[PDB]
A and B are shown apart, each in its own frame.
Chain A
Amino acid sequence: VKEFLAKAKEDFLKKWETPSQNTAQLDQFDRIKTLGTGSFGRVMLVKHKESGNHYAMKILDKQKVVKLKQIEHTLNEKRILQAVNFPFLVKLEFSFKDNSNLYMVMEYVAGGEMFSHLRRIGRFSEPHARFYAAQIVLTFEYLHSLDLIYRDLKPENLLIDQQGYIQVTDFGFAKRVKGRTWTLCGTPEYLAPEIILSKGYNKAVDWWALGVLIYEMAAGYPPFFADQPIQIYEKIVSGKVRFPSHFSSDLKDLLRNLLQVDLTKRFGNLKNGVNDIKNHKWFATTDWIAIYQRKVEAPFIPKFKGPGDTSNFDDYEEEEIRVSINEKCGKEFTEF
């Protein structure tokens, strides 16, 4: 592993220092349908004219980005995305901007969000959960080795591809950082205690979030929930977790070590780093090399009927893309 990661860090660094810009333009794509909306922008299914390929195009209204003070975050998202390269990471193909918007064109993952399948089916069996978990583990091992923190793990940001494997999307809150950071950002149910308590945090938060994900997948609901975010923070800070009867002994053991309020004891943040997790009982039957190579038998494979099929995504109110005649926020987004 240390042999492989070393080569990855090199390609990453070259692109991190000298990012690509303006690799396409709006008129090369035919907008088809919205695949999803977010606190920030919308993602549409588009078709590239010259090639005929489908892509998912994320659209960001510059003015909205500014109002919400997400300038630096948007710049991180684009800079990081265009530099990373991993099997379980969504791939950025092109990126550009016009007078009103910022655009990121990625590979289209037609399998739908893990969110929809998880909520339709109820919950995933442990072997099923483990399959997904393993992919996130390797993914976090890659990201963290480059000094990156994800900060927004959740089923809504995980896509299922044609082979049944995961593709992590949305690097909205991703940040390259050595040492600690302080931004209060993420989704309430997934926030680590360090965040809520405003004490400065590191990579460790991603590991806690993995704990919430695994729990949500196996139980069918998150470990901490309520009707208002404030009530949720109280639960997370107390550290009181209750497990479903059907949860195996091994799973409960892993979880207790990931949902550990004391970041000096939290798995992933100890001396052996990612190995405490990989070597844990719950993952004993997991062949790590097999999953990285995608040679494993996917437990669930979504049904898609040809290219362009959006049947695995919910329908959304279509909204017309507006391009002002005047350039908006030119200086702020120069490097984009």
Chain B
Amino acid sequence: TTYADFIASGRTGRRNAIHD
């Protein structure tokens, strides 16, 4: 399922900004 795919990805924690 999409949820299972999300939980297995490397981006489930606090996400940091991207900058110039």
Query: What is the interface of chain A, defined by CB distance below 8 A to chain B?
Result: 38-39, 68-70, 73, 115, 119, 152, 154, 156, 172-173, 183-189, 220-221, 225-227, 229, 242, 244
| Number of interface residues, chain B, beta carbon within 8 A | 14
Interchain CB contact under 8 A, B18 and A186:
yes
Q: Complex Cα distance A140/B3, Å? A: 30
- Contact partners of B20 in chain A: CB under 8 A: 69, 183-185
Q: Total A-B pairs in contact (CB under 8 Å)? A: 52
Chain A minimum-CB-distance residue to B2: A221
Q: Shortest distance in angstroms between A201's beta carbon and chain B's nearest beta carbon?
A: 14
Q: Which chain B residues border A226 with CB–CB below 8 Å?
A: 9, 11
Q: In the complex, what residue of chain B is closest to A38 when comparing beta carbons?
A: B16
Q: How far is the CA of A115 from the CA of B6 in the complex (A)?
A: 15
Q: Mask for B1-20, Cβ within 8 A of A = 1, else 0?
A: 01100100111101111111
Kindly state the separation between the CA atoms of A70 and B18 in the bound complex, as whole angstroms. Answer: 12
Question: Which of chain A's residues has its CB closest to B20's CB?
Answer: A183
Supposing A220-B3, A225-B6 touch, asked if A39 and B19 sit within 8 A by C-beta, the answer is yes
Q: Are the C-beta atoms of A187 and B3 separated by less than 8 Å?
A: no
Name which residue of chain A comes closest to B14, CB basis.
A156
* Contact yes or no, B19 A187, CB < 8 A: no
Nearest Cβ distance between residue A157 and chain B, in whole angstroms? 10
Instruction: List, in ascending order, chain A residues with CB within 8 A of B6's CB.
Output: 220-221, 225
Question: Which of B2, B14, B15, B19 sits near A244, CB closer than 8 Å?
Answer: B2
CB–CB A225/B11 < 8 A: yes
Q: How far is the CA of A207 from the CA of B11 in the complex (A)?
A: 23
Taking a contact as CB atoms under 8 Å apart, the answer to whether A188 and B9 are in contact is: no
The interface centre, meaning the residue of B3, B11, B17 with most chain A CB atoms within 10 A of its CB, is B17
Contact yes or no, B2 A184, CB < 8 A: no
A185 near B9 (CB under 8 angstroms)? no
For A188, the chain B residues whose CB sits under 8 A away are 15, 18
Q: How many angstroms between the C-alpha atoms of A179 and B18 in the bound complex?
A: 23
Q: Which chain B residues border A186 with CB–CB below 8 Å?
A: 17-18
Q: Which residue of B lies closest to A116 (CB)?
A: B14
Known A220-B3, A221-B2, A244-B2; judge A187-B9 contact (CB<8 A).
Answer: no
Chain A nearest CB from B3 CB (Å) reads: 6
Is there contact, CB below 8 Å, between B18 and A187? yes
Query: Is B19 within 8 A of A185, CB to CB?
Result: yes
Q: How far is the CA of A227 from the CA of B12 in the complex (A)?
A: 10
Shortest CB distance A334–B (Å)? 22
Q: How far is the CA of A173 from the CA of B14 in the complex (A)?
A: 17
Instruction: Decide if B17 touches A152 in the complex (CB within 8 Å).
Output: yes
The residues of B that contact A119 with a CB separation of less than 8 Å are 12
- Are A242 and B2 in contact, CB atoms less than 8 angstroms apart? yes
Q: Within the assembled complex, what's the spacing in Å between the Cα atoms of A327 and B12?
A: 40
What residues of B have a CB within 8 angstroms of the CB of A172 in the complex? 17
Q: With A69-B20, A220-B3, A242-B2 in contact, is A225–B9 under 8 Å at CB?
A: yes
**What are 13 residue pairs bridging A and B, where the CB atoms are less than 8 Å apart in the complex?**
A38-B17, A39-B19, A69-B19, A70-B19, A152-B17, A186-B18, A187-B15, A220-B3, A221-B6, A225-B9, A226-B9, A226-B11, A229-B18
